[PDB]
Amino acid sequence: STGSATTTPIDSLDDAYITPVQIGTPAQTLNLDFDTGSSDLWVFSSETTASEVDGQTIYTPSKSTTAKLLSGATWSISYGDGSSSSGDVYTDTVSVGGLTVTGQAVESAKKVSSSFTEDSTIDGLLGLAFSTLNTVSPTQQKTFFDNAKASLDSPVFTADLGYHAPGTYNFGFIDTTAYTGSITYTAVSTKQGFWEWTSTGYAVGSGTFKSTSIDGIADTGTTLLYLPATVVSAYWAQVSGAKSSSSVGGYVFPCSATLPSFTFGVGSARIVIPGDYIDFGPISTGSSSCFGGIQSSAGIGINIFGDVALKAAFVVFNGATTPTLGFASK
Ligand code: NA
After folding, report:
1. Cα 322 from chain centroid (whole Å)
2. Which of 110, 117, 113 is closest to 56 using CA atoms?
3. CA–CA distance, 232 with 273 (Å, rounded to integer)
4. Cα angle at 142 between 222 and 108, to 5 degrees?
5. Residues 119 and 10 sit within 8 Å (Cβ to Cβ)
6. Is 257 exposed, middle or buried (0-12, 13-18, 19+ CB in 10 A)?
7. The CATH number of the domain where 163 resides is what?
8. Which is the catalytic residue, given 14, 33, 35, 119?
9. 165 alpha carbon to ligand 1 midpoint, in Å?
10. Are residues 46 and 124 in the same domain?
């Protein structure tokens, strides 16, 4: 089997991407944030505290003939941005882009933090990291990918995120029409439960490539590119008037600037992030200070190749017995 679904930016900045997901019988379609940095599939639901719901579409298990309470199971998750959610668990039929899993754990939120409530466009998350990170207790649950894997034509999924445009998540196949050149594969460590890999270096604009190992994660659920402070300083030093602002919470730059590209290494291959991808616009409405898309990972404890990096590439998440990542230009 295979599946193929379009993923759409939630706003003009590509802050996140939503993908429609069918849950239950008859189908209830919710728009979920596919997150390769976490391992829970959780939804706004008929159980979510009413004051914490503001515009989201909810899953109502009582209206699904295939829903079953997973008795005694609870979940609770905290993300890198300080957001959180928790609740109970149902199993139900879940389909993505025509690929169906029966018996998928659907984590129903009883509580969500303010950042979720305030984002009316995201109805929940679909985690695509390794199932070792799944938070269901007392019986850990599998991701949608891990449950689908054995049925797929190939044990893979691909992320093809757009810049200010829709893109695609495919399951079970490589679309050889969706990228240019060849795919470079690189080793993955699953020790922390992430798609963790090592970039071979970077360049700023037209500058020379610096060969240096950068360990980080491929995380579709993180907006920005978080890298070591040395790398980030070297990037922003090429932008007149850029500075790190403790009041704003990272590097800002004059909205009048033209940003340089940023290149990262994948083995001997190179992925180029155009400068425009690094502009996250005014820090507040009408400001002439703009927020940067490359930020320091110092204090986060891991480097994160978030959407800024991933949307410059066609990315293969190879879930074979020995997982690997692939990157191609597009
Ligand atoms: Na922000």
Report:
1. 22
2. 117
3. 14
4. 70
5. yes
6. middle
7. 2.40.70.10
8. 35
9. 20
10. yes
Contact between 70 and 2 (Cβ < 8 Å): no
Tell me the C-alpha to C-alpha distance, in Å, between residue 284 and each of 160, 207, 223, 281: 29, 32, 18, 9
CA of 96 to the centre of ligand 1 (A): 29
Q: Report d(CA 8, CA 171) in Å as an integer.
A: 17
DSSP notation for 213-236: EEEEEE-TT--SEEE-HHHHHHHH
Catalytic site residue 199?
yes
Domain count, the chain: 2
Which experimental method was this entry solved with? X-ray
Q: Are residues 12 and 74 in the same domain?
A: yes
What's the 250 CA to ligand 1 centre distance in angstroms?
Answer: 9
Same domain? 194 vs 152:
no
Cα of 151 from ligand 1 centre, angstroms:
39
Query: What is the whole-number distance in angstroms between the Cα of residue 262 and the centre of ligand 1?
Result: 20
What is the whole-number distance in angstroms between the Cα of residue 13 and the centre of ligand 1?
10
- How far apart are the CA of 16 and the centre of ligand 1, in A? 12
Question: Residue 26: which residues within 8 A CB-CB, separation 6 or more?
Answer: 63, 64
Q: Are residues 240 and 267 in the same domain?
A: yes
Structural domain span for residue 223: 175-330
Look-up of token digits 């500058």 = 207
Residue 278 φ then ψ, to 5°: -95, 0
| Residues 199, 324 within the same domain | yes
The two structure tokens encoding residue 243: 């500075």
Q: Which of 108, 199, 296, 297 is catalytic?
A: 199
Whether 35 is catalytic is yes
Asked if 146 and 70 sit in the same domain, the reply is: yes
